[PDB]
Design a protein around this ligand. Structure first.
Ligand SMILES: [Mg+2]
Ligand SMILES: [Mg+2]
Ligand SMILES: [Mg+2]
Ligand SMILES: [Mg+2]
Ligand SMILES: [Mg+2]
Ligand SMILES: [Mg+2]
Ligand SMILES: [Mg+2]
Ligand SMILES: [Mg+2]
Ligand SMILES: [Mg+2]
Ligand SMILES: [Mg+2]
Ligand SMILES: [Mg+2]
Ligand SMILES: [Mg+2]
Ligand SMILES: [Mg+2]
Ligand SMILES: [Mg+2]
Ligand SMILES: [Zn+2]
Lengths: 143, 72, 55, 124
RNA sequence: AGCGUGUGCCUACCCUACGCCGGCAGGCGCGGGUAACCCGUUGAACCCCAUUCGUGAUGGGGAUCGGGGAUUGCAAUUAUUCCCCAUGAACGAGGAAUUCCCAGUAAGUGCGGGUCAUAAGCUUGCGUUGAUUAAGUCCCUGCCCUUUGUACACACCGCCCGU
């Protein structure tokens, strides 16, 4: 129960800071694009015990987790689990992560804006997008 | 203020647990967590280890509450 | 021609496919037990139908 | 730089049949195509093809007007001028290759964006 | 657990057991019920017993958005509804003011009926767990009586005086 001599209080994974005091399953959800389900299935695929903290892992385990996370399709992770199934531009299934997600959302908004679809116009104006009523709600953030 | 509790035992805290906890007359993961600046999970693990070693009696076990006591 | 266009819109479901059997009104319709009456006509004819107020 | 729809460029899209295009589309478009198109959509497609055939080699085709706001933009429509009814006026839209899979009604807005005035006496 | 519904003049639209396929929404077969007969011994939810977390806007909360899949429809875009990954906002018990309630009651928790091609954050009912406080008063609010005053009777939202 004593802390190991080599313990990582802070980890640097994918330009993200991971708190080594949290359990490994929930520690890696700090990466944008990874949730509880995806983190749990990745760790179950890596054959890593879920009863240890993030800082207790060795470098081999960390790099294995990163490699499995980058390429889910290689490690029998199903397509329906992925969050970027059937890309519009290239048609490839994948899981998009911290910065890639940030620019992929930007490209998805730019596509709608340039083509002048109604949803893109709503995004440009700053209004609701999924057909909600705006008369009485959503006042916060407006003058 | 913020409450920063240890998640893994240190030398001083492990010595405190091994020396003073078995004499508290009322041992509870919340009590050990509050006195030793420890998280609840580490306190539960330490109390289970002490119970396994036989240094502490168990009075009642429940999911909400576990109660320990010093040996007679 | 006109024969095709007139009344062409399908009316197999919805409020436009049902009406009261007494006054031909489409609002407040009662379909339970196949009554097919609006609430006002039902309140007018309840005693004749056989519905009694006990509570 | 070259346009590709899910890894397929425009020429192959034009060569593909409807069954091949069903797998490229999304669930709603696939279901719509599986249920089939009716007479009016075929008439609109025929009119668009007729208009595009008669265009001069360097000029745009003549605008074809329609009320069909639920028509799915097929790859054969790219490069045609369609006036879409919005309830009051026919708005002119040129089909771009990036419009494949959307409806026509998404590109002719049905309301005027709100610019607010001073609130009246009845507001508290 | 309990109250109930279920294949319809026009009228298209019922409740579903069992086997297989799919990870899920679902899809295929093949049967029962016009009903104390079938769904159904209605294996409901809170609740109970264990596991993990540990005062951190946190594994609390789930708003807003991206990408996919499926069902109802003639038609789903201004997202019908449903499913899966991802994103993860305010909110740490709420000012002046104000509502309802006296026992199987208040509150917690689910389930039926109405609307219903698609369908409940509403309503109308049903159970399950189950209390604190009180057996008084006219202080507030309101409404009744009796006495009393009136120049009011379109009845104080009245009548009426002087610049
Ligand atoms: Mg995350
Ligand atoms: Mg809406
Ligand atoms: Mg608003
Ligand atoms: Mg959070
Ligand atoms: Mg959270
Ligand atoms: Mg979508
Ligand atoms: Mg509208
Ligand atoms: Mg989620
Ligand atoms: Mg209800
Ligand atoms: Mg219903
Ligand atoms: Mg209502
Ligand atoms: Mg009083
Ligand atoms: Mg007097
Ligand atoms: Mg008098
Ligand atoms: Zn009637």
């Amino acid at each position: 129960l004593v802390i190991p001599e080599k313990f990582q209080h802070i980890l640097r994974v994918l330009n993200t800071n991971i708190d080594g005091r949290r359990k490994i399953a929930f520690a890696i959800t700090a990466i944008k694009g990874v949730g509880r389900r995806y983190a749990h299935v990745v760790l179950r695929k890596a054959d890593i015990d879920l009863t240890k903290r993030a800082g207790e892992l060795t470098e081999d385990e960390v790099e294995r987790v990163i490699t499995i996370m980058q390429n889910p399709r290689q490690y029998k992770i199903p397509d329906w689990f992925l969050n970027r199934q059937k890309d519009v531009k290239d048609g490839k299934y994948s899981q998009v992560l911290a910065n890639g997600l940030d620019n992929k959302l930007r490209e998805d908004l730019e596509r709608l804006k340039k083509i002048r679809a109604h949803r893109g116009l709503r995004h440009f104006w700053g209004l609701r997008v999924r057909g909600q009523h705006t008369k009485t709600t959503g006042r916060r953030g407006r003058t | 203020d913020k409450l920063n509790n240890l998640v893994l035992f240190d030398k001083a805290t492990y010595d405190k647990l091994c020396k003073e906890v078995p004499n508290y007359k009322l041992i509870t993961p919340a009590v050990v967590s509050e006195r030793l600046k420890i998280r609840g999970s580490l306190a539960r693990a330490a109390l289970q280890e002490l119970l396994s070693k036989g240094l502490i009696k168990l009075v009642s076990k429940h999911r909400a509450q576990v109660i320990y006591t010093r040996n007679t | 021609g006109h024969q095709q266009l007139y009344w062409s819109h399908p009316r197999k479901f919805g409020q436009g496919s049902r009406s009261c059997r007494v006054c031909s009104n489409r609002h407040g319709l009662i379909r339970k037990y196949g009554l097919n009456m609006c609430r006002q006509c039902f309140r007018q004819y309840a005693k004749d139908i056989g519905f009694i107020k006990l509570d | 730089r070259k346009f590709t729809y899910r890894g397929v460029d425009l020429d192959q899209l034009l060569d593909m049949s409807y069954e091949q295009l069903m797998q490229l589309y999304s669930a709603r478009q696939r279901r719509r195509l599986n249920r089939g198109l009716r007479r009016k959509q075929h008439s609109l497609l025929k009119r668009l093809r007729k208009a595009k055939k008669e265009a001069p080699p360097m000029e745009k085709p003549e605008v074809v007007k329609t009320h069909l706001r639920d028509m799915i933009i097929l790859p054969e429509m790219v490069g045609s001028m369609v006036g879409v009814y919005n309830g009051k006026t026919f708005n002119q839209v040129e089909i771009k290759p990036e419009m494949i899979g959307h409806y026509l009604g998404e590109f002719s807005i049905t309301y005027k964006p709100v610019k607010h005035g001073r609130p009246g006496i009845g507001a508290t």
